[PDB]
Structure formats: C-alpha cells, structure tokens
Write a protein that binds this ligand. Sequence first.
Ligand SMILES: Nc1ncnc2c1ncn2[C@@H]1O[C@H](CO)[C@@H](O)[C@H]1O
Length: 269
Amino acid sequence: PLESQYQVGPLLGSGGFGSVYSGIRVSDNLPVAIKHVEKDRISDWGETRVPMEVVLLKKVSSGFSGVIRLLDWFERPDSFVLILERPEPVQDLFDFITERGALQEELARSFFWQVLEAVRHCHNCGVLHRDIKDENILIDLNRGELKLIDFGSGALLKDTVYTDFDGTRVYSPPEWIRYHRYHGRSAAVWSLGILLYDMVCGDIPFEHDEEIIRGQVFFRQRVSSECQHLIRWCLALRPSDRPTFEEIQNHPWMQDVLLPQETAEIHLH
Ligand SMILES: Nc1ncnc2c1ncn2[C@@H]1O[C@H](CO)[C@@H](O)[C@H]1O
C-alpha cells in the first residue's frame, strides 16, 4: 500500500516518460521521486510481467551512484508507480546549460567523465540506456555528482543489431537515420559525442537528418583542438570508426579530471 509509506508532494515534471512527483518516505523522511506510468502507454515488458524500465533499473540499482536508483515499485489497476531516489538540490544538465551557456572544458571534462563511468556501469550490468542526453542527466549541485535518469527507452544490452529506436532523433546515429539499424555500444558512443558537443558549445551540433548523415561538425564556440578531436572521433560516420569507452577515457582531453566535490566547489557552489 504505497499510499502510506510515502507522502506525495508537488509535480516535478512530466512528458514522454510519465508524471513525476516529489515525495518523502515516512520512515526516515528520505526525499524520493514518485513516477507514474500508464500501462496503455508502454510497449516493452520483461520479468512477473513488469515494464522494461523496471527490469532495467533493477539490474542497475545497487551501489554505484552514477544512476538514479530504483528504491521500490508498485503495480496498480492501470499503471505502475516507481519510487526513485531524489537528490537535493538538483538541476538537470539541460536547464544548467540553458542558464549558464557553454561550459568551461574543465567542468565539461568532469561531467563527461562521470557520464562515461555511469554508462560503463549500465553496460557492465547488461543495460543500454539508448537515450543519453542533457535532459536525462541530473546534477547534484552539492556533491558535484551526475546521475542518469529515465531508462524508459532502454533495452537489455545485446551484441546483435537493434531495429527499433524511440529515443531522441537529434541524438540518433547516421546508421539509424539511413538503415533503421544500429549496434548498442557504437550508437551509445555517438550520442556521447552529441552530448559532449552540447556541453562545450551550449547546443547540439545537428538539427536535420541531412546534417546527421553528412557528419561535418562545425564549432560555433571556441573549443580546444583535443576536445574537437574527441568529439569528431565519437561522431565518426562509420560505426566501427568510433572510439570504445576505454579509448575515450584514455583520450588526451580526458586526463586530469576533477573529483566530484572539487567540481562542486569550483563550479557549482
Ligand atoms: N529521480 C529523480 N530525482 C529527482 N528529480 C527527478 C528524477 N527523475 C526526474 N526528475 C525531474 O524531472 C525532470 C524531467 O526531466 C528532471 O529534469 C528532474 O528535474
């Protein structure tokens, strides 16, 4: 009877993922997030038959704080209720970039690095997010830690080809736009490339399908040669020409990353 262990609060947000309410867990007054999803609105299920999002979060919710952990969940007549952690204060990368504009490379380095550790975490756990982007990245302003959210478009990690994709088009790779097919790890790397550009330029690089398939990336902001190189590498047109997570984390631009707390005092506090 979820309607007792938690006390609902204001509506944090809503959209193509459901409706999320701020809440508190009467038992330790733990700040939580309560997400509602209508059964009629989901297409992927796994296992009892629960929405894929729950299966994904469960395999990924133990320990490492790179992803928002799923604390619990309940089933209702026509929907599922998810109890997620809720850091405070917090701000998603989209709003953060929208307010501060392009990020200094030291900050983008720390942020990108943490996203990479989080993505490696999910992959290691057999989960592919499929919708990595600013909006799905939460920033814990006080600890300087980022956390991944909304695995609603995710899928179990597999080595074979994918033929479905309901993520964010502007963050989709050329192979999806042209052949309606892609592979997990390399598609993920491509979106990682869009994200990085978004961070240091303050906006995504491609708007139209033609631009995505063209691959030419123009910089509207001043960014180091090393950063431009990593970005271009992640955005290689041919999937196999993209770097592996290891190659990204070993890239020259990725060295000397700040620690989360250091990031918070220098850039967030
Ligand atoms: N687990 C969560 N904890 C805190 N806030 C969240 C969580 N999931 C979604 N949100 C809020 O809802 C918005 C929807 O993208 C996010 O920007 C964030 O503000």
